């Protein structure tokens, strides 16, 4: 890194700074007087203070990026959000007043819930005991669960089974499927858990 260890990461949060002094605790008061003496890294070009900033979508976009082509990866993401929203407006106008109440039209809410329905609680990791590697069903940390839900979704859309379908149409179709606890990616979650249940006897390795 070209930053010396002395450089601290920037905190990009308008609210954190407008917070009144009285509400602050003696611990939070010390952190604020300390940072005035610290070196701060330059804010990355990725994240800004914009009210429309979503760290999850920004992360999903980077996991779709091929060869540093952020423009294309970003274009695919926004095309997916537009495709999800249009599919819901078409389902909304074609529905009855009763069904309309249950139809979600926000693509950010669908995107987040679609991934949360794919996060695997438990995974298989080879813990070694006795000179052999046994795929032990191990709990998964929160970081790993969120990452696996993204990698599985991106991998499924890159599968060759889809013939000539553009990514914004594939991904939108998979997100709405997973949003309803349906799809191949949801099956991958279920099968991973079922495999982890068949190896419960191997938890001692």
């Amino acid at each position: 890194s070209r930053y010396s260890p002395e450089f601290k990461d920037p905190l990009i949060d308008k609210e954190y700074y407008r917070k009144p002094v009285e509400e602050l605790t003696e611990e939070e008061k010390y952190v604020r007087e300390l940072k005035k003496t610290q070196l701060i890294k330059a804010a990355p070009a990725g994240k800004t203070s914009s009210v429309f900033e979503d760290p999850v979508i920004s992360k999903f976009t980077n996991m779709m990026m091929i060869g540093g082509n952020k423009v294309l990866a970003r274009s695919l993401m926004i095309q997916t959000l537009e495709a999800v929203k249009r599919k819901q407006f078409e389902k909304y106008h074609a529905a009855s007043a009763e069904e309309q109440a249950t139809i979600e039209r926000n693509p950010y809410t669908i995107f987040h819930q679609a991934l949360k329905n794919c996060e695997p609680m438990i995974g298989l990791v080879p813990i070694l005991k006795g000179g052999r590697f046994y795929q032990v069903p191990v709990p998964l940390p929160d970081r790993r669960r969120r990452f696996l839900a993204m990698k599985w979704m991106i991998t499924e859309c890159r599968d060759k089974k889809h013939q000539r379908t553009l990514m914004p149409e594939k991904l939108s179709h998979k997100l709405l499927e997973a949003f309803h606890n349906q799809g191949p990616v949801i099956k991958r979650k279920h099968d991973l858990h079922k495999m982890a249940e068949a190896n419960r006897a191997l938890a001692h390795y």
Partner: peptide
Amino acid sequence: LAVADFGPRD
């Protein structure tokens, strides 16, 4: 393991 969702069993 008990909390986890194993999907519609079959």
